[PDB]
Every structure is written in structure tokens, then in C-alpha cells.
Design a protein around this ligand. Structure first.
Ligand code: 3VN
Ligand code: MG
Ligand code: MG
Ligand code: MG
Lengths: 293, 296
């Protein structure tokens, strides 16, 4: 799975997942050229969803994408490998087109550990598995050597979502293993990653501006770097402001400000932004045309 | 404030055939008690909290509580979570099953803001009536409890009595105790146990004490009595083992050392954790030779 993809926010209403809004947000993604959706990633507050909720989000999404050509890359990562295998199987059993699997967080496995963790996951299913490196959140980094070995050693492993701010590593990955699918995990540098041969994005910004992110990715895949860079440059201010506080606090605030969700609700320890950052997000949004439903 | 201080151990969790070796767990805790340790921390990072089931997590806390009854040794139960609802539940559990207090690591992976951290710990503290020790380890969580947030929580919440600091930032340790000297600063970094204690820290939550509880015990008690020459001498002696126990991610080296010492049956982890490199295995074995390891 490649192309423009959205790390879906998870809207809450009165402390529960707003399931109708969840399906409605995914339809809006489909209407605006998105190629795949990622239920229950970091942006979807996977850490604070119950097992049941995690499972249901994937189900809505698979169901809502059914019939369209939009794929579901299910959030299935865990820092407990038994758990990650579990999630992988669930996704497969419930029709996900594939899986996203974040590098274990908090426990800091070694490179050998990561290899084992992912081999376990990959062998438990037969759908594509997309590796996810975000060391600022996990405390560990999947080495370039480890990524490559996994790609070559495990049939299902087809690439990595990179959120490390390290374009050198992106060169390193595609120079030594050009067959893998490098996916941008940091919206601000979507174009530089695509222009080095990246084949997709898993975007926070596309929650609010899916048409802009989808166009950017498709310009780039069609080798119109001029127009892809144009959108990337235009999106920089919003791409930065969406991380003025830890994601998904700004994007949910933006979605609520645009009237796209009913309630600016998080699950603790996530919370509302500062009032000043709230106003900063509101101000930056005003320079972009935000698609409705 | 009610407090839990002194020399404390972040207990490893031994596995046998993919199950918690509950008999070895109790035996290991008794070894800590008999070597001068003041409190034990079941199921922290060193106890592989991430890969235990909820039931196993509960079981290890209960085993700790039961093993320390009839002694002066306290149980500071590992109760952290990156989901506030789960952390409150763990705090409640620890309270209801006889723990003396809880340790609660800063939420990992989802990187809450300072406002969110405040709210997170306030909900935990307001849910029980036993001491709560914050735990700051930004290298593992991806976030930091700022000094201001720590102090605000200490002053605003009755049961929050201090912080376990594992951030290699002695400046912050000065900052903390210079602006709020009533709090209990606990070293979460073995190599710098003495510097933290010598600045007014009141205890350690140690990985090395799994292997050398008597030495960590003496270091802390020497330091608490302001016998800084003797405390520093032990800290200096311990530096080599303190560092080698993090050649690979904790608790991979300490469990390796415990296995080499014959203190656990199997060198078993739960994935994504795994045995160390063959090279680091030998390095740990070599460093160990320079220390006298207490038996059972
Ligand atoms: N997607 C919904 C599940 C969320 C579970 C958890 N909050 C905690 C994961 C866990 N491995 C649970 C350990 C439970 C026993 N201590 C962790 O806290 O590390 C996470 O993965 O962030
Ligand atoms: Mg398409
Ligand atoms: Mg994931
Ligand atoms: Mg004395």
C-alpha cells in the first residue's frame, strides 16, 4: 500500500468514540482523492482506546472503504510483541488491506529485538506490513540496516513510515534498497521524501486538508515536482502549526474549529491546547480553503 | 507528607517457560530484604511492565506486598501507564491490595503536554490516599515532567511527595531541591546515585541493587547520614558495573547478570526484549568478576 494516506483522528463524544462521525470523516477523505486510511495510529490516540475500541475503529473504515478503491492500513503496533501479533491477526481477519506497526515504545528493544518483533508480526499474517519509525515518541530507532534486513527477509514487510526528520537516512534507505516503499511520516517534508523516491505519505495534515495532501502526493508520483513542491511550500505554515503541541492536539483542535467534529474531546493524558496555541491554530487555518463534507 | 525513601530496588521479573516465576520472584524479594533494602518496586521498567499481562502485573504487586509483611521494607508499586484511566486503575489496585505507595512513570509514546501531565497525575493522586512518586525518564517516554510541573504537583496534591529522576541532569536536581526542598528527590540513575544523594536526594530506585543490594544499601544509608566519603567510595567502586548494566537496554544486562550469578534459572525475556549480544554477554561477565555478589 502506497500513495496519499491519512492518520485518522478519533473523534470522541461524551467520552465514547463518535462512530458515525468516524465513518463520515473517512467518506470525506475518500471524496478528496486519498488512497488509504490509517485507523488508530498515534494520531488516532491508540494509547487511550480500549481494545474493543481499537478493534471497532478498524472495522468502521474497512466497512466504510469497502467498494471504493481506498485501502485500509490498520494501526496494529504495540510495544508488547504478543500484542502486536494479536493486532496484526485481528486486522487481517477483519479485512484490512495491510498493517502499520510502530516501533515498540518505552521498552527500547535492541536492533536484534526489533528484528524479532517484526519477524513475528510479519509471519503471522499474509497482508502487507508497514514498519513505522518515530524515535521522538518511542525512544528507539529502527536502524537502516534493520529495516532493510526485514524488508529482504520477510515477504510481507514492504517499507517504512519515517518520522525522524532525517533526510540523510531517507537517502541511505533508498540508495541501498531502492525496492522498498519509503513513506513520509512528517508532513512538513512530504515533498523532499517523495522527490527522493518515496512512494507515499501517512499524513496528519490530510485530516484537515486531504485534497491538498493528496494532490501533493500525486503530483510527486507523476514526477511534477514543481507543483508538488508548490503545495508543500504552501502547506508549511499549517504543517508546522499542527505540531505546536503534541499531535493530535492541534489537528483535533483544527478539525473542531472547522466544524468537522462536534466536540474538542481528548482522553487523558491528552488535553486541550493552551488558549494562545488555540488562537495560533485558528489564525493559520484562515489561509487555507478547508473542504466540507 | 507520607513518604517512601531510602534504598529501593526496581525488581526484575524472572520468567520460566514464558510464565512469571512467582517462586523465584518471592525469593528475589527476600534476598533484597535480607540485604538492607528499604523498599521494592514491582513491575517498573526494570520489571518489564510493557510485556506483562494485566493479571501478571497485579500478581507481582501482590507477591511483593505479601513477601514484605512483617518487615520494615515497603512496597512502592509500579503503577504507571500512558493512559490516565489505566494509571488510575493501577493506583487503585495497588492501594486496595496493600501497597505502601505507587511509582507512576510519565506517559510514554503519546507525549502529553505539561498541562496534560498535571491533569494525569492529579487524577492519579486524587484516586488514592497513599504516597505517589512521579517518575521522569525522558529517554524512554519521549517527554519530560518539567521542574515547574513537578513542583506544582508536589504543592497541589497531598500524596505526591517527590520524583524519581532518570534524566542525567544534575542541574535539574539542583533546580528541584533549591525551589522545593521539601520534596523527596529519588535517583533513578545508578551511576550518579551519590551526587543526587549528596545534593539532598533522599533515596535511590536502583537497577544495580538487583545484583548488589548490600552495596546500594550501604551507599544510600552512608549518604543519608552525611557520611559522604564512604558513600562516594561505594559510588566510585560501583561505576564500572553501573555503566555495563546499560551496555544494552535495561533490563537486558541486569537480567543477564542475575542469570550469570545463578540468581535466576533462565535468561528469558518477553519480546521485543531479547538476550544481549554474545560480545556484551562476555563484557557483563567480565565486569561482574570485580564484585562480591551475595547469594540467597
Ligand atoms: N491500542 C489500545 C491498547 C493501548 C495499550 C497501551 N496504552 C499500553 C500498552 C502496554 N504494553 C500495556 C502493559 C500492561 C501491563 N503493565 C504498556 O503500558 O506498555 C499502549 O499500547 O499505549
Ligand atoms: Mg487513488
Ligand atoms: Mg502503529
Ligand atoms: Mg546511622
Amino acid at each position: 500500500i502506497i500513495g496519499a494516506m491519512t492518520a485518522l483522528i478519533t473523534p470522541f463524544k461524551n467520552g465514547k468514540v463518535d462512530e458515525q462521525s468516524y465513518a463520515r470523516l473517512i467518506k470525506r477523505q475518500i471524496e478528496n482523492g486519498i488512497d488509504a486510511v490509517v485507523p488508530v495510529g498515534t494520531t488516532g490516540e491508540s494509547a487511550t482506546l480500549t481494545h474493543e475500541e481499537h478493534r471497532t475503529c478498524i472495522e468502521i473504515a474497512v466497512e466504510t472503504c469497502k467498494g471504493t478503491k481506498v485501502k485500509v492500513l490498520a494501526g496494529a503496533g504495540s510495544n508488547a510483541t504478543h500484542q502486536a501479533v494479536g493486532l496484526a491477526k485481528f486486522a487481517k481477519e477483519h479485512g484490512a488491506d495491510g498493517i502499520l506497526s510502530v516501533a515498540p515504545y518505552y521498552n527500547k528493544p535492541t536492533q536484534q529485538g526489533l528484528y524479532e518483533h517484526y519477524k513475528a508480526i510479519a509471519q503471522s499474517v499474509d497482508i502487507p506490513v508497514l514498519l513505522y519509525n518515530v524515535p521522538g515518541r518511542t525512544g528507539c530507532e529502527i536502524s537502516t540496516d534493520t529495516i532493510i534486513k526485514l524488508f529482504r527477509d520477510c515477504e510481507n514487510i514492504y517499507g517504512v513510515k519515517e518520522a525522524s526528520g532525517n533526510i540523510d537516512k531517507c537517502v541511505d534507505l533508498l540508495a541501498h534498497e531502492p525496492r522498498m516503499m519509503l513513506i513520509s511520516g512528517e508532513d512538513a517534508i512530504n515533498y523532499p521524501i517523495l522527490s527522493n523516491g518515496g512512494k507515499g505519505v501517512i499524513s496528519v495534515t490530510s485530516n484537515l486538508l486531504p485534497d491538498m495532501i493528496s494532490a501533493l502526493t500525486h503530483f510527486a508520483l507523476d514526477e511534477n515536482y514543481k507543483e508538488a513542491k508548490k503545495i508543500n511550500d504552501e502547506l508549511y505554515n499549517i504543517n508546522k502549526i499542527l505540531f505546536c503541541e503534541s499531535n493530535p492536539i492541534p489537528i483535533k483542535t483544527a478539525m473542531y474549529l472547522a466544524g468537522l467534529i462536534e466536540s474538542l474531546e481528548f482522553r487523558l493524558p491528552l488535553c486541550s491546547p493552551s488558549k494562545e496555541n488555540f488562537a495560533k491554530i485558528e489564525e493559520v487555518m484562515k489561509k487555507y480553503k478547508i473542504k466540507g463534507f
